[PDB]
């Protein structure tokens, strides 16, 4: 199907505790494949998926160089934004950035992304045209003018339409046995009496990849969106994910309830019920 590559940068100041830390991680879909941490004894871009290990030393040296440069540039950027918001030198602050590209099944660019945040709030984003910026406030307007003078949008459009798509296609091929393999969930329904009046039906999905999944409870065929408790999808640690959905049903009415599971790994969507 469709695929994505995303990089996630976190830069954190910590006054009185050294210079700001810079971390970068890269993902293809829901698979992390590289990391960098400026706090490491010897900071290097490092592999986190087997299929990236085959890249040569020039690859690792170049990505390390970019990340070491970024460590310094984000320290400057944190100093700049502290000034733009008239903030004291005593507080800790965070800049985050996420960027990358989505491609269709034919490998063609669906869209590109580049968004930055300051202390968890939207700060500046590259618009979908890959040519203009949306600045959140008058501080971000300063960054926008700097980036316009540096022709940043033009350079990101070149990256997003070129290298980002080309490297994503290379990774998808080199890791095809995992990145292009959808593992369906293992499913079951459990029954948890609450009282003599009510019980909990919990529909489980385990071992699936990628994380995208739809779990829903129906009562007599009608969706129970407002009444269904959905837990946040969680990583199992072996690349796969887990999720459950729960609904409180009147005792004796359990057969009116069906759990519906949609996932890319499944031959067809599943309908499940409690089987006492």
């Amino acid at each position: 199907g469709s695929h994505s590559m995303r990089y996630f940068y976190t830069a954190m100041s910590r006054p009185g505790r050294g210079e700001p830390r810079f971390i970068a991680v890269g993902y293809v879909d829901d698979t992390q494949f590289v990391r960098f941490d400026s706090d490491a004894a010897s900071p290097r871009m490092a592999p986190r998926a087997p299929w990236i290990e085959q890249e040569g030393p020039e690859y690792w040296d170049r990505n390390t160089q970019i990340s070491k440069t970024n460590t310094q540039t984000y320290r400057e950027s944190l100093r700049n934004l502290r000034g733009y918001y008239n903030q004291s030198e005593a507080g800790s602050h965070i800049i985050q950035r996420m960027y990358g590209c989505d491609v269709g099944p034919d490998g063609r660019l669906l869209r590109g992304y580049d968004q930055s945040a300051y202390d968890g709030k939207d700060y500046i984003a590259l618009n979908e045209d890959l040519s203009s910026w949306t600045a959140a406030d008058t501080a971000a307007q300063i960054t926008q003018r700097k980036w316009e003078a540096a022709r940043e949008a033009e350079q990101l459009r070149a990256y997003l339409e070129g290298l980002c798509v080309e490297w994503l296609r290379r990774y998808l091929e080199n890791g095809k046995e995992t990145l292009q393999r959808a593992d369906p969930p293992k499913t079951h329904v459990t029954h948890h009496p609450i009282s003599d009046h009510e019980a909990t039906l919990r529909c489980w999905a385990l071992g699936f990849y990628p994380a995208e999944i739809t779990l829903t409870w129906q009562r007599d065929g009608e969706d129970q969106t407002q009444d269904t408790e959905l837990v946040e999808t969680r990583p199992a640690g072996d690349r796969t994910f887990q999720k459950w959905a729960a609904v409180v049903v009147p005792s004796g009415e359990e057969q009116r309830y069906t759990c519906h599971v949609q996932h890319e790994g499944l031959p067809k969507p599943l309908t499940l019920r409690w089987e006492p």
């Binding site: 990089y7 970068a24 890269g26 871009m45 690859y59 170049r62 990505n63 970019i66 990340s67 440069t69 970024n70 540039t73 984000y74 400057e76 950027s77 700049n80 934004l81 800049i95 960027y99 930055s116 700060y123 500046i124 960054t143 700097k146 980036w147 540096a150 940043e152 350079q155 990101l156 990256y159 290298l163 980002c164 490297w167």
Partner: peptide, 9 residues
């Protein structure tokens, strides 16, 4: 592959 290092904010 990372994007090249860009301009400070």
């Amino acid at each position: 592959h990372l994007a090249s290092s860009g301009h400070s904010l």
